[PDB]
Ligand binder design. Sequence first.
Ligand SMILES: Nc1ncnc2c1ncn2[C@@H]1O[C@H](COP(=O)(O)OP(=O)(O)O)[C@@H](O)[C@H]1O
Ligand SMILES: [Mg+2]
Lengths: 1144, 50
Amino acid sequence: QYRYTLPVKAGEQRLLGELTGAACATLVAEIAERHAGPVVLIAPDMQNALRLHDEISQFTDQMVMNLADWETLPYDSFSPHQDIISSRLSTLYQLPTMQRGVLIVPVNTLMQRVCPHSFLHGHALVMKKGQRLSRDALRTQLDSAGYRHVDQVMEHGEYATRGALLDLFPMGSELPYRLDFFDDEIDSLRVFDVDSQRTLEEVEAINLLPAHEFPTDKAAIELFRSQWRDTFEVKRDPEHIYQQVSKGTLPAGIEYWQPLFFSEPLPPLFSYFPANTLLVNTGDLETSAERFQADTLARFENRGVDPMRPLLPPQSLWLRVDELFSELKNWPRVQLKTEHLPTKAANANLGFQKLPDLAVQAQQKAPLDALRKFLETFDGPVVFSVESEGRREALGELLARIKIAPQRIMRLDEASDRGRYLMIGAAEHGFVDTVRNLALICESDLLGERVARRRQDSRRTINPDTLIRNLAELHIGQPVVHLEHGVGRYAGMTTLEAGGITGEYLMLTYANDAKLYVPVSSLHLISRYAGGAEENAPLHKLGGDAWSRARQKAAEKVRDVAAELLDIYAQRAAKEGFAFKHDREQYQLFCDSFPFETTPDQAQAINAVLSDMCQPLAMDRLVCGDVGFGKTEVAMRAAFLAVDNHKQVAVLVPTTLLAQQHYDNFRDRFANWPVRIEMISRFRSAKEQTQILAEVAEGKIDILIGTHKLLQSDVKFKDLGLLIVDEEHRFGVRHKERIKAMRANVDILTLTATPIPRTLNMAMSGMRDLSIIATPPARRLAVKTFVREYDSMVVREAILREILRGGQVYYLYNDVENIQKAAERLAELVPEARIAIGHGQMRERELERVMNDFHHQRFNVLVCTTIIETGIDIPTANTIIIERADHFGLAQLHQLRGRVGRSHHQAYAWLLTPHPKAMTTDAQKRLEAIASLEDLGAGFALATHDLEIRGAGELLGEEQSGSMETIGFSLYMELLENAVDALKAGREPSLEDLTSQQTEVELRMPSLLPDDFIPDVNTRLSFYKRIASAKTENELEEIKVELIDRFGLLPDPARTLLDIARLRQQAQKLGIRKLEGNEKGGVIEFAEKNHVNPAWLIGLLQKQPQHYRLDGPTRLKFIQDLSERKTRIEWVRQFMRELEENAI
Amino acid sequence: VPLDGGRFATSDLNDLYRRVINRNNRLKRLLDLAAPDIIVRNEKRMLQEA
Ligand SMILES: Nc1ncnc2c1ncn2[C@@H]1O[C@H](COP(=O)(O)OP(=O)(O)O)[C@@H](O)[C@H]1O
Ligand SMILES: [Mg+2]
């Protein structure tokens, strides 16, 4: 039986109270399930409405929809992205008659006037099986409706006519239809997919709705001009919308010229409600509607100027709140209040009280203490309502800690007398229903409170004999310690100003007479000197050398790269590539498993990749193109082609998050295909990675996605055949080469969005193949951007634009110290927001806490640094606001500009800049570069313009994107072919390959052949080869004297190279696998079948434990402050020279 | 010609010719790549300006 009574009368109320969050959903659910009549729930704000659009589904199977709001403000300047319109008026077709179900409308679209039934009913039509309606006659009917003729119909309002075959997409339905007109008549109503392009099935009749919410034809345009010349005035200007629609084109903000197109007052949509319709109210309309009207009037009087596009009076386009609250009195109303209403008829307070605080914390030994106490002492049913099925596992083990396994029920009425039950939905705050004694315990009821605290009061032991009790009787000059700065001399009382206030402070004269003051209020930061040396105390300098110690510089090319990358490219060019085999139907099956169709640009890229990948040459290919254009499926097809030959693809991505994304994408795609795939990064335990590496070494794993854990000299592919680098930028050089050094002829394949200028230039010179991609697969609506000087009102209007639409905002502050302040500054500017912070220096658990709050829309605005560069993209986040677009990489700006969207919601990307004189010239150039080239496919153009701004870095070295005057392209090709000849000539092994024969002789010192001493790089590489290959000391000094003959005396790095090889010789002879020496010491590691004397090592350890400590049988950590590398060399040489007698 | 300090004089014609050669080589590569129309359009615009 029920608990209250449905109201059916003109304007009566029914007041339901004592309700708390996520119970309004179940009340209106039972309202829908118990009442004959459509239920229109009118939320106090669209944000709340969106939340309700989840929860009602969770509690009922009855039909639900929203009425789609235009996502702009009143009197804004944007078309609503007519897609939205396609939803909107569709509801207006069915709203005349809907017997059951619920429609959720916020107050905004509740009070807007809408197009009358005359227009919509008249310009709607039906097409059945048997009309004798002619082909071009129906085409002209579509023209008079105002659709658009394109041959590639994908989105709404699109039609094609080709001879007899006709297709169109009605704005009311959700799928297109094909017609096949014969003898000037309809013969087929075939639904064919937007992706399949083939008839799914055949219907007999379907309905058509017109273009959009006002007519467009020439009679209507004449009516529009007549009514404009009635009310407003005209001025000849090609941007003035009067003449601009006299040219026929509809402007951006034309939807706010609704009543002009219609010759009658617009209905307030209450006529659109059925006669027997009930309204339920949430919160208080009398405040929210009034606030919206005040905002509309303020924005109108702000914009009721600029006679170029003047504006209407709101008393015609929008309702007035008095008119609203009078017209409400023709519909019965049920008000849901979160407050205890005292007593009267038509008013029942339903006990839906708060749950007690079931907070879970691991600080106590028992985490689920409150839960295990509450559930056992409870006497009724309890339901948990997990959000996602995977999160249901998050239920299962946690409730296993007190050993509770709940039931899975669909409807809440399936609750029994007492028990534990789980279900699926989106509710967020549980409750207790006293009438049936129900408990609802949501996901956020166990993870309630966000915490922010680090540390405090380390050395605050304020009773030491040295705190001086803050007696203030100290004579001037006695030294004083301040805990944050240091020791100095007290110098008395002083009086200062700090911005219009007086104050008394403590003068402290530290070293070099840099005065410091602290107020007398904070006297507890002051202690007497504790060393007992009041006449001998030292004097610190304030803060220390923060920037003075940064004048060091140098660290001469610790190791040169101009003689290594040349070797790598020589190994690449010398050996030929690998041969792949592609089988047309076999690979075509993998094409079919892809449930989409590729663009012509994707087809070009796939043809290029497949062609060059089958060939016996070494691929080096960019698949540059803007984000969201489907680059992944290219490398995905290529990976399929490689694994068909069993050649162990290796994807490499520059973060664990992208590694996870590629891991589950490849696994889900290749779920049907028999193959093994995994990710590897820091999130894999070492206990698991040691298994993964062995499985890879035997070659049981065909695809290893991972972050830089690849290039850690530990993976050993049995046969690598295809590297796929993703997001090329943020991999520096030698990260892409530590993997190429292992196998010379790997088929590189490098995706990106914006290449770094070095790799873009080296693609533009024919060294790297390039394949630009554009034409995104779905219609993909671009992200408008703006470039503005930072203004407290433009940021506010952007934030309210995104909030009242119902979407999150990426506020990008790019700072850690001041972001805490900027949170409350933005909160004070925008009271209507729910702001919280997230940055990289959070404790990495609060960070993912904030992210998983952000996926569930619990707070709109996220002031955040550039951690979102990786992005965890949600659907609602649709406005990024860069606070300082002054200093950012152009690639970074584009990438963050691509982080928004991923929906049918038109996004925005503001780039707030400082004063145009304040920003640097390079900042200027970046700003017009990003402002001008704004369209689809601007990913490549931005990097192309980034080149010649920063200049391509040195071709044969590290350090992409530098304007240096190094070796040219002509000389580089010469060096490469000379290296190819000298390599292919005499049997000469690879450099890095004989690093396999090398022992680890790291000393952290310049040990190389310097470029000043030997200018040409190929002779330098030849000397590297001959040094590292030589096996006797007499050969080593033979090379040394040969250096004396050709280029004279040795610099210190050269002689260190020679004696490092000298060490290497008898190091291999003694089995010394690894040794590292440094400033303070190091560790030496030998073989197992080694000559290290047990008696001698025991003697060394027991005679000098402070300078020798074995951690293991062979790992010897020595601690010796070898300040000079000279002393380092002498110590290690004499040590191992003493070892060779003990070598037994 | 050199300014006696290890540098050379500007000789502005060399700078203008360098701009033209750079832009023309860029356009040649972009034609060899069958690049999309907007980027080759911008490069031809900037070549004409050079
Ligand atoms: N033919 C297609 N139809 C529908 N969606 C597609 C199609 N091709 C690609 N996509 C979508 O585009 C996205 C591909 O982006 P991806 O290549 O993974 O990274 P990026 O965003 O850097 O391009 C995927 O989310 C996929 O859903
Ligand atoms: Mg990608």
